[PDB]
Amino acid sequence: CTCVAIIMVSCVTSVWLLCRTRNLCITPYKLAPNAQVPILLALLCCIKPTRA
Amino acid sequence: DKTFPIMLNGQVNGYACVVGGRVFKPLHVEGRIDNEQLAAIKLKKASIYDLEYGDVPQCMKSDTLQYTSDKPPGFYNWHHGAVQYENNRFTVPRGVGGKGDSGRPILDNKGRVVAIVLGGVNEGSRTALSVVTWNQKGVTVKDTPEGSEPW
Amino acid sequence: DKTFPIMLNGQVNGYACVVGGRVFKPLHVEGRIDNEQLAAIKLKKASIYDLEYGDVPQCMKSDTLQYTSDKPPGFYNWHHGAVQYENNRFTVPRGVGGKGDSGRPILDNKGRVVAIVLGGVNEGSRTALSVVTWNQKGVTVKDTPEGSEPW
Amino acid sequence: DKTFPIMLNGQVNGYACVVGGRVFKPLHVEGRIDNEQLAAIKLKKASIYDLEYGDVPQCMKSDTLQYTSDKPPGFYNWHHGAVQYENNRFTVPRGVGGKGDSGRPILDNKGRVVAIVLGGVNEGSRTALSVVTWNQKGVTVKDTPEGSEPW
Amino acid sequence: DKTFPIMLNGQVNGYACVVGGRVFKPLHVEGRIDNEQLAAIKLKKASIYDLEYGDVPQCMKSDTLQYTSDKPPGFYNWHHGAVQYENNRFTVPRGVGGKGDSGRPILDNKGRVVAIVLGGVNEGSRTALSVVTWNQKGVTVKDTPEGSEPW
C-alpha cells in the first residue's frame, strides 16, 4: 500500500511537469499564427501538427 | 481602431485590444469588458506572454493585422502621441503614463499593431514603456525595463 | 412599434412581440429578452403556438390588439414589404426572409396583428410563411406549408 | 441639485437626496438606485425616520449644504410651489402631491436644504405635508399632522 | 513674505516658514536650510504638532504676525489660490496638491499667517488639507481629515 502510493504520486507529478512543458510548447506560437513553426518543435518534442 | 475598454465600479482601469483572430486583455486589471459578445469568451490565464482566447465567431474577425518582422527604428503611431524606438520604447512626455492606461496598442504607419503597453509609470525625465513584441521570427517576447511598475 | 428582440451571445436571433395582455416568443430560439421589465416574467411551455406568460405590469398593458375573424384577402403591411392573402401569407420574393425574422407580427391597415411568422425560409420560387392564425371563429391554429425549415 | 431618484419596475417611486454627512433615502418607498457609484453603499436600516446609512466617499460629499435650525417663517422654494411658515407647514395649491414622488428636499433662498418630505398626499383644501425638521438646536424631529397619509 | 525652501540633494522638498517669535519646519521632510544665519538653529524632534525651536536673534524678528481665534469663513490668501472656509479647509481643485511643498503658510487679508499646511496629497475629486488651526483662545490645534497622506 505504501508502494502503490509512490507510483501514483510520481506519475501525476511527472505528467504535470510534461503538461507544463506542453503548455509552454505552444504558447510562444499561438500569439502569432503568421510565424512559421519548425519541424523539430512540432512532432518530436511537442505534439501539434501544421494547421491553417 | 476598435479597442473596447474594461469597466470596474464605473471607472476605466484597462483596455482590451483585438487583433486578427484573437482578443487581448492584460492580466493585471480586473473587470468586465463592455462588449457583451466578448464576455462569453472563455479567457484563460497564462504566463507573462499574455495568452488569451479568440473565441469570437466569423462575422467580425481580422479587425487589424499584427506587425510582421523587419522592424525599422523610425516613426510609429500611438494613441497619446508618437514613439520612435524599436529595441526600446521612446521617452514619451508626461500626461501619458498615469494609471489605468494599460492594454492600449501601438500601431504602425499602415495601421498595424506592433506592441501592447503594460507598465512603466514614470522613470524621471525619460519614461520607458514595458511592452510585448516579437523579436526576430514572430516569437512573442516580453521586454521590461528597470523599475517598471504596473501601469 | 413595441417589439423587443431576443439576443443570445450579443447577437439578435429572434424577435418577441407583445399582443394584448400576453407576450409571445418563439421557443425554437434561445437567449434573453433585453428588457429588464420583461426578464422578470416567468416562461411556461406550450405547443409550437409559442406561448409565454402575460404577467406584464399595469403601466404598459393593451399595447397592440389582435384581430378576430372575418379577415379579408386584402393587402397587409409587413416589416420588410407587404403580404396580400388570407388562407396563408403571400409567398414573398427571394432575399426577403433571412435568418432572425421569427416572431415578427403581421399587421393590418389599422395596426391589428393577424399573424406571427415562425417558419418557411425557402419554398421554391417564392418563400411561403409558416404563421400562427386565428381561425374562422376565434381559435388559434397553426398553418405550415410542406418542407418549411424553421427559422 | 443632484438627487438620484429610486427606480421600481421602470416607473419612479421616490427621490433619494444626497446631503453632506449622510445620504437620505426613504425606507417607506422601495426600489434600487440605478447609479453604479451609489449601488455600492451598504443598505443599513435605521429608526422611524426612514433613513439610509451615508457611506458615500468624502469627495462627492458636502456638495449640498443643509440649513440649520431657527428658521424664519418666510419664503421657501418647494420644487412645485412655495411654503411660507415656520412651526407648521403652509398651504400648497391642490393637485400636487400624488403618489411615489416623495423625498424631494425643501430648500431655501440660499440653496441650503431645510427639510425632507415624507408624507402629505391630500389633506383637504389647505395642503399640509408631513416632514422631518430641525426643531431648535439641531435635533432631527419628524413632525406629522393630524390625519396624515404616507406619500 | 519670507519663506525658505529646504535643500535636500539638489531638489526642493519642503518649505520652512517663519512666524513672529518662533520659526517652523516640517518634521516629515528633511534636508538643509537655505539661510546662513538659520544654520545655528537647534534641530529637534517633537510631537504631531510640528514643533520646532525658533532661537533666531532680534535682527530678523517680527516677520509675519500671527492671527488670533474667531477666524471668519471668508477669503484667505493661499499661495496658489484661495480658501473660503473656517472649520474645514476649502476644497481646492486639481493641479494643486502635488508633492514636496509642505509648510506653506496661509495668509489673511491683513497679511497675517493663520495656518501651516502639512499634508493631503490627493483624496479624489476634491482635496482636503491637514492643517494647523487655533480653536478658541489661541491653543494650537492640529487638524487632519480621513486618509490624508503627508504632502
UniProtKB/Swiss-Prot annotation, chain A:
Q: Subcellular location, in the record's words?
A: Virion membrane; Host cell membrane
Record note on quaternary structure: Processing of the precursor of protein E3/E2 into E2 and E3 results in a heterodimer of the spike glycoproteins E2 and E1. Spike at virion surface are constituted of three E2-E1 heterodimers. Interacts with 6K protein.
Quote the PTM field. Palmitoylated via thioester bonds. These palmitoylations may induce disruption of the C-terminus transmembrane. This would result in the reorientation of E2 C-terminus from lumenal to cytoplasmic side. N-glycosylated.
Q: Where is this region: Transient transmembrane before p62-6K protein processing?
A: 25-45
Q: What is the role of the protein in this entry?
A: Plays a role in viral attachment to target host cell, by binding to the cell receptor. Synthesized as a p62 precursor which is processed by furin at the cell membrane just before virion budding, giving rise to E2-E1 heterodimer. The p62-E1 heterodimer is stable, whereas E2-E1 is unstable and dissociate at low pH. p62 is processed at the last step, presumably to avoid E1 fusion activation before its final export to cell surface.
Q: Give the Cytoplasmic membrane side ranges.
A: 18-52
**Annotated protein name in UniProt:** Spike glycoprotein E2
TM ranges are 1-17
What organism does the UniProt record list as the source? Answer: Eastern equine encephalitis virus (strain Florida 91-469) (EEEV)
Its placement in the membrane is given as: Single-pass type I membrane protein
Quick one: where's the S-palmitoyl cysteine lipidation?
25, 45-46
